[PDB]
Design a protein around this ligand. Structure first.
Ligand SMILES: Nc1ncnc2c1ncn2[C@@H]1O[C@H](COP(=O)(O)CP(=O)(O)OP(=O)(O)O)[C@@H](O)[C@H]1O
Ligand SMILES: [Mg+2]
Ligand SMILES: [Zn+2]
Ligand SMILES: [Zn+2]
Ligand SMILES: [Zn+2]
Lengths: 610, 57, 162, 115, 47, 98, 141, 101, 59
DNA sequence: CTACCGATAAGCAGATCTCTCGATTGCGTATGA
DNA sequence: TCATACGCCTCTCTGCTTATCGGTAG
RNA sequence: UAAAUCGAGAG
């Protein structure tokens, strides 16, 4: 971070959502078709996974933004799946909604009055009326049902209206932990009740019972002998993704009233209708080439696992597209039943294998098919889930710049609040001091001294982000640069800025000094720095050992160097070792001399000593 | 095949040889010091299967 | 000119950043940081090239303060000493409109393009025979059917026919 | 400290393609300072101080038509102890391809060294 | 269970206001505990 | 300072209305123009519609959508958002000075 | 996420309240060490008074209301001490509930006030009980 | 220039004004907390390092943090602290009224 | 360039455009430079001095 | 009599600090040489 | 005769969730 | 310059 580069805009809040097929088609820069990442020559191939419209590759300029590899942000692309595919994340919701539904009247198997009551309760809980939701149940009081629907709706309308006017809730809806818990309990009970009772009461017709074998195949069972009797009185096949999508799309269109409140924890200010074509992905989004770059040894080049999965995706898609084309000619040129039947069975197997393929691409565990294998390629879910996943390893904790680590050795000659910084660390760790009227002499001397003689400077960052390194500069060049340190900036845009000198860590600085495991606050304090020019160990006073729980033992502990004034003033005051005299566990002190100072005091304070 | 077994430690068999573990069968005879070297030849292992269970008995 | 003022005063509400060195002189700091560069530059949001400004104001971050207080509050970002604040200022912007009549002189004449200078400050793009035979001069009424603004300075193109 | 590293030139042409990289010096304009740590046959002199950025061996490649050098890859200064030329068991009397280089680093007791 | 909690948050369009330290760390915002539990204003003496 | 300012600090552009970080991109100037940052999802193709239109690198012309700002975010956040987009999940980021 | 707010009530990051007071007294565990050491405080009264400087902590403080309510509540509890736990109908809530301990001198805990009064009654000692009580109330603040 | 921005600005300022707690009824600690002191010192040091005007006598001092501490000792820091309450309301204390330690 | 140091983050126009009143721009043109010089070296005055006299006389 | 409602029995899914080195990377097969 | 690209090639804890055997009113 | 598995270690 550069304190000379202020940022005005802020990310106030983040809301999750589902990508629609239309926007990604409008968003994407190219459509990936062939499953050939690299040709014989290794040059990127148009339409492949490494197309130049997905980000600059190696030395190739990106064909979308016209920027080099270091300057190209990486533009996303998309692929076109032949058959709509179940999203493996939302497959449980797909199963729950496919069950507990009627295929004839295209409503839920629950009563319309019951689903209306649940929708009213959820709408009340949207704004936080956790009490009016329970008070709505006592409005029980064929033709009167239409009145009962209005009476509950009228009660809901005024309950929100009185709550918004007096200030109990804004138009965005109040969302707290307890209303979230009540909403979750209500939704769980609603789903359990939905899945419970058959015999759809809207039209009184039994419906087939579905079943699943894995996360890719779904089968249904026809009605039994007693069940097939009552179907006509009113007057284990394999189901297809397209037809389940159509069924759920029509059901959602019919039951928007309840689905909107089931699918929203806040009032739907956007008014956008929820659609069943959200659990089905007809388009996959390929991460840019920057995030799919290939691994590189000195010579041993290994393919990207995501690229392998996407290439297998594209191979299956091309096979399905070619089979469908062959299916067309076998129909215009009419043939026997089996001639089309064999390739239709092959096409169904291809649908199943592409479903399993997308399941493998998203989730490694959901993949099916392994005889011997070597290692099952992790899905995108596996890249974000476990302790080694993206979250717990790359945002809950990151590798840090400007930080050192070494073995600790004792030093009773530092002021019980300082750290013994070896001269090897003192010439690498720097701080970006901006030049001023009062800093000019010290920073000029540091620049003249250079990156090798402590105290000294390694870089001179100009006003316009230009970093001038002092590693390969002679004494005369460094003297000229020090002379040109503080000069009036000619550029109008950079007239409010001054050069920054990356001075070495002087004696006045403060560092964060930490030992693992950090079991409490005291195991990470901020010590002042004392530059001891002898050897290469971090030298620590003897009082801190009690809190750090280390011995001079081969023990090692890190030393982080904060790089801005807020962190300096806040490690010198809030995190400094003086303020940690008493641990918050019980208020008992944690510092003090340890082993031979106690015996020296016992011998010195005895009255036998004159 | 035997050279691969020696250089990697993994045991590739179609029967299992009545042995619970699969990998970690060969260790490098390190020669940092003669005590280490001679200790390599007298040591025994309960098995890599016993390096994860929490029963301390 | 063509019985059109073409000089429109458009107030704006701009979010700016104030340098730490402009703390005891904040309004002048804001004007010299942001408003001065906008002079004689085409800005699409305001409508056209800005001629100047007057009536700069700083929106206080303490709402309970008066509207005439001489000590206002600027919000300092956590990561940077620079301060960000809203502002109100009236922009005097030249606002040409397409399809209208504009009067401009001619300064540089070429074989193909005619250099029309509206008030000698609107760049655009060897006597010959005209419809009436009069030598080509600077005073003429041209059309604004096509406007060029990809370059550093906006330009206009057109023909005598409407 | 004794450390050895193997300079296996025949690690990129792992196929049956003939030798395209030979130890030694080419005929291009390679710097003359490379001869202060390297012999005439593109090999390090015994008992030589090698630090970070210092040439270790010089190889000539017939394709790039340039004289490239491998480099020492440790910040700890070392001495060249032994250089071995390993032959090929194959009947083809190939040129010198794989070379073993051994380093010697003085580990004098500084503070922090466990006793 | 990053997968399970992601579906439970995306099904109902759970908008989060970045209040817990984990969310602020993910989005790279200044924390709300300690020295980040308040703002800082500047008293500029304009005309 | 330990987690963002000195690890993966990036001043990535962001779209104000779509609330997406990697949907934005840079434009290609014609002559003496400026490569303004534009949003791909915001921009409409010129078929369905100077200093009003911007082109891609392949010659396509997109109109509108040229409003965006800069925010200070970690790069791992951008990678996570890309991974989520691979899952069919969209993250929308609300920018304060709208 | 749970942290001390500016109401002296600790609560989670979103805003849900967990406690109205940190432990019921809102005193730091680190600084609690020498709030019961009445003998030590009496011995180093002069040093502690020089450290605290009550003279400069008057124009921004209210001293009378909290002390009056504390005395009233203390007399109420002493009168009603010999009562069952459930029968002790609450008429005067603890002074910490109403008066901010960081702005009203004398708005201390029931335990701390009881200990201070017991010490001042059992130990009859230039320092008088009034100045010592004021110093220790400032120490609690 | 639409009223579809004037209305948003007006409602934003109205909400901000309703959020602010008047000076006559703020009921927070008159003392300056350690976090507030540290943040004030850090921000003032940042401003000084970025060439902001100073008011104290620079008696041979080169550390912006030390200059900030000197200004805080002299109570000449021109900064206002916006203490935030859980609901969103804020009280605008300044370093002058706040008393240290 | 085009950073947060010389360009506004947001430049939304608060109200509708309004033409110049009182029929004289000299109520601002004569006072624009009066508050300016009584840097900006990008022909900010050189090409700005050619728009004031034309409405008054001849260049 | 029989459907809604529970009360187990069983299965299923998810869990159980940092740092430094070294070593290693598949069979199997099937056709153009 | 015989080499590299294509095609795959068995001893711990907490819940939740679904299915199935008993009961009550209508 | 990579990435995974196994093995040996330090606190
Ligand atoms: N699994 C583990 N996790 C964390 N720390 C560990 C550890 N195993 C060993 N250590 C470290 O090993 C060191 C052993 O120190 P301790 O046994 O706790 C004090 P001690 O018993 O008085 O040692 P002493 O007998 O040499 O005087 C600790 O510093 C500890 O941090
Ligand atoms: Mg130790
Ligand atoms: Zn690109
Ligand atoms: Zn039905
Ligand atoms: Zn957009």
């Amino acid at each position: 971070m550069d304190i000379s580069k202020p940022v005005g805009s802020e990310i106030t809040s983040v809301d999750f959502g589902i990508l629609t097929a239309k926007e990604i088609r409008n968003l994407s820069a190219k459509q990936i078709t062939n499953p050939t990442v690299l040709d014989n020559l290794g040059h990127p191939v148009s339409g492949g996974l490494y197309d130049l419209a997905l980000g600059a590759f190696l030395r190739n300029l990106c064909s979308t933004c016209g920027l080099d590899e270091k300057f190209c942000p990486g533009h996303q692309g998309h692929i076109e799946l032949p058959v709509p595919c179940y999203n493996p994340l939302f497959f449980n919701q797909l199963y729950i909604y496919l069950r507990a539904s009627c295929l004839f009247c295209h409503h839920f198997r629950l009563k319309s009055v019951e689903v209306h009551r649940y929708a009213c309760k959820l709408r009340l809980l949207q704004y936080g009326l956790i009490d009016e939701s329970y008070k709505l149940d006592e409005i029980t009081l064929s033709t009167l049902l239409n009145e009962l629907k209005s009476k509950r709706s009228e009660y809901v309308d005024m309950a929100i209206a009185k709550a918004l006017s007096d200030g109990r809730t804004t138009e965005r809806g109040s969302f707290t932990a307890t209303v979230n818990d009540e909403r979750k309990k209500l939704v769980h009970e609603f789903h359990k009740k939905l899945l419970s009772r058959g015999k759809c009461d809207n039209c009184g017709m039994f419906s087939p019972k579905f079943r699943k074998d894995g996360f890719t195949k779904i089968f249904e069972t026809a009605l039994n002998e007693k069940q097939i009797t009552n179907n006509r009185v009113k007057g284990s096949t394999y189901i297809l993704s397209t037809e389940v999508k159509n069924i759920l799309d029509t059901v959602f269109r019919k039951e928007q009233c309840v689905l909107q409140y089931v699918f929203h924890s806040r009032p739907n200010l956007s008014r956008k209708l929820v659609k069943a074509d959200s659990f089905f992905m007809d388009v996959l989004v390929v991460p840019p080439t920057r995030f799919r770059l290939p691994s590189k040894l000195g010579e041993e080049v290994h393919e990207n696992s995501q690229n392998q999965l996407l290439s297998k995706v594209l191979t299956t898609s091309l096979l399905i597209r070619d089979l469908n084309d062959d299916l067309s000619k076998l129909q215009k040129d009419k043939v026997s039943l089996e001639d089309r039947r064999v390739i239709f069975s092959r096409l169904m197997n291809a649908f199943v294998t592409i479903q399993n393929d997308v399941n493998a691409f998203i989730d490694s565990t959901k993949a099916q098919g392994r005889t011997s294998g070597k290692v099952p390629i992790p899905g995108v879910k596996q890249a974000l889930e476990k302790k080694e996943g993206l979250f717990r390893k790359h945002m809950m904790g990151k590798r840090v710049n400007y930080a050192a680590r070494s073995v600790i050795s004792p030093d009773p000659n530092i002021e019980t609040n300082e750290i013994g910084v070896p001269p090897v660390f003192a010439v690498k760790l720097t701080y970006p001091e901006p030049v001023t009227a009062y800093n000019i002499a010290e920073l000029r001397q540091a620049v003249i001294n250079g990156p090798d003689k402590w105290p000294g400077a390694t870089q001179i960052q100009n006003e316009d982000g230009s970093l001038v390194s002092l590693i390969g500069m002679s004494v005369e060049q460094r003297k000229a640069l020090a002379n040109q340190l503080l000069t009036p900036s000619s550029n109008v845009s950079t007239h409010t800025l001054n050069k920054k000198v990356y001075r070495h860590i002087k004696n006045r600085d403060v560092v964060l000094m930490n030992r693992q495991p950090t079991l409490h606050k005291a195991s990470m304090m901020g010590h002042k720095v004392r530059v001891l020019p002898n050897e290469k160990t971090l030298r620590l006073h003897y009082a801190n050992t009690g809190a750090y729980n280390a011995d001079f033992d081969g023990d090692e502990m890190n030393m982080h160097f904060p790089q801005n004034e807020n962190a300096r003033a806040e490690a010198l005051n809030l995190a400094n070792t003086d303020s940690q005299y008493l641990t918050p566990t019980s208020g008992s002190p944690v510092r003090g001399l340890i082993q031979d100072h106690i015996s020296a005091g016992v011998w010195l304070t005895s009255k036998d000593s004159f | 095949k035997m050279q691969y077994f020696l250089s990697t430690g993994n045991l590739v068999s179609q029967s299992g040889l009545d042995l619970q573990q699969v990998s970690g069968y060969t260790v490098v005879a390190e020669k940092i010091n003669f005590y280490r070297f001679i200790s390599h030849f007298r040591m025994v292992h309960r098995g890599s299967f016993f390096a994860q269970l929490k029963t301390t008995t | 000119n063509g019985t059109s003022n073409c000089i429109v005063r458009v107030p704006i509400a701009l979010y700016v950043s104030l340098a730490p060195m402009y703390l005891e002189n904040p309004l002048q700091g804001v004007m010299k940081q942001h408003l001065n560069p906008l002079v004689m530059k085409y800005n699409n949001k305001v409508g056209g090239v800005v001629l100047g400004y007057e009536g700069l104001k700083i929106l206080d971050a303490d709402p309970l303060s008066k509207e005439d207080t001489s000590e206002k509050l600027i919000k300092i970002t956590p990561d940077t000493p620079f301060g960000f604040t809203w502002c109100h200022v009236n922009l005097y912007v030249w606002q040409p409109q397409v399809g209208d009549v504009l009067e401009g002189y001619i300064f540089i004449q070429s074989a193909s393009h005619i250099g029309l200078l509206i008030h000698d400050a609107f760049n655009a793009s060897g006597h010959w025979v005209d419809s009436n035979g009069e030598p080509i001069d600077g005073k003429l009424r041209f059309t604004v059917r096509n406007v060029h603004t990809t370059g550093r300075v906006v330009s206009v193109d057109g023909t005598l026919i409407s | 400290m004794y450390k050895t590293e193997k300079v296996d030139l025949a690690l990129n042409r792992n196929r049956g393609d003939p030798i395209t990289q030979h130890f030694g010096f080419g005929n291009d304009e390679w710097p003359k300072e490379w001869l202060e740590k390297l012999d005439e046959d593109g090999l390090p002199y015994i008992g030589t101080y090698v630090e970070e950025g210092d040439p270790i061996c010089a190889y000539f490649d017939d394709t790039l038509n340039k004289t490239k050098i491998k480099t020492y890859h440790s910040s700890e200064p070392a001495y060249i102890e032994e250089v071995n030329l390993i032959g090929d068991e194959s009947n083809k009397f190939q040129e010198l391809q794989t070379v073993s280089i051994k380093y010697r680093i003085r580990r004098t007791p500084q503070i922090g060294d466990k006793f | 269970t990053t997968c399970q909690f992601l579906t439970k948050a995306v099904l109902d369009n759970e908008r989060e206001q970045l209040d817990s330290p984990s969310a602020r760390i993910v989005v790279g915002k200044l924390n709300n505990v300690g020295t980040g539990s308040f703002d800082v204003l500047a008293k500029v003496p304009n005309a | 300072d330990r987690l963002l300012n000195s690890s993966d600090y990036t001043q990535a552009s962001v779209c104000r209305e779509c609330g997406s970080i990697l949907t934005t991109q840079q434009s290609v100037p014609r002559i003496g123009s400026i490569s303004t940052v534009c949003c791909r999802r915001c921009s409409m193709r010129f078929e369905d519609a100077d200093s009003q239109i911007w082109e891609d690198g392949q010659g396509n012309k997109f109109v509108g959508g040229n409003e965006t700002t800069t925010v200070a975010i970690p790069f791992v956040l951008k990678y996570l958002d890309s991974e989520l987009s691979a899952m069919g999940i969209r993250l929308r980021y609300n920018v304060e000075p709208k | 996420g749970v942290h001390v707010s500016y109401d002296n009530s600790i609560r989670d990051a979103d805003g849900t309240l967990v406690q109205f007071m940190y432990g019921g007294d809102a005193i730091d565990i680190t600084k609690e060490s020498h709030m019961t050491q009445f003998e030590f405080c009496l011995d180093n009264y002069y040093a502690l008074l020089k450290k605290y400087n009550p003279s400069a902590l008057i124009e921004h403080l209210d001293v009378e209301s909290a002390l009056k309510y504390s005395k009233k509540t203390l007399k109420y509890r002493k009168k009603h001490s010999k009562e069952p736990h459930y029968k002790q109908s609450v008429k005067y809530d603890p002074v910490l509930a109403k008066y901010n301990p960081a702005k009203y001198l004398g708005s201390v805990s029931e335990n701390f006030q009881d200990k201070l009064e017991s010490f001042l009654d059992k130990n009859s000692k230039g320092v008088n009980e009034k100045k010592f009580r004021a110093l220790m109330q400032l120490k609690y603040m | 220039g639409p009223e579809d921005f004037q209305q948003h600005e007006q409602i934003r300022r109205k909400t901000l004004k309703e959020k602010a707690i008047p000076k006559d009824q703020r009921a927070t600690t008159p003392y300056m907390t350690k976090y507030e002191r540290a943040r004030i010192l850090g921000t003032r040091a940042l401003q000084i390092s970025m060439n902001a005007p100073v008011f104290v006598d620079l008696e041979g001092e080169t550390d912006p943090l030390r200059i900030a501490m000197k200004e805080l000792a002299e109570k000449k820091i021109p900064l206002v602290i916006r203490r935030y309450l859980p609901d969103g309301s804020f009280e605008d204390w300044s370093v002058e009224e706040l008393i240290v330690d | 360039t085009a950073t947060t140091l010389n360009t506004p983050v947001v430049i939304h126009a608060t109200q509708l455009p309004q033409h110049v009143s009182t029929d004289e721009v000299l109520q601002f043109l004569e006072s624009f430079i009066d508050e300016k010089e009584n840097t900006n070296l990008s022909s900010s005055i050189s090409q700005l001095k050619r728009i004031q006299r034309d409405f008054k006389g001849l260049p």
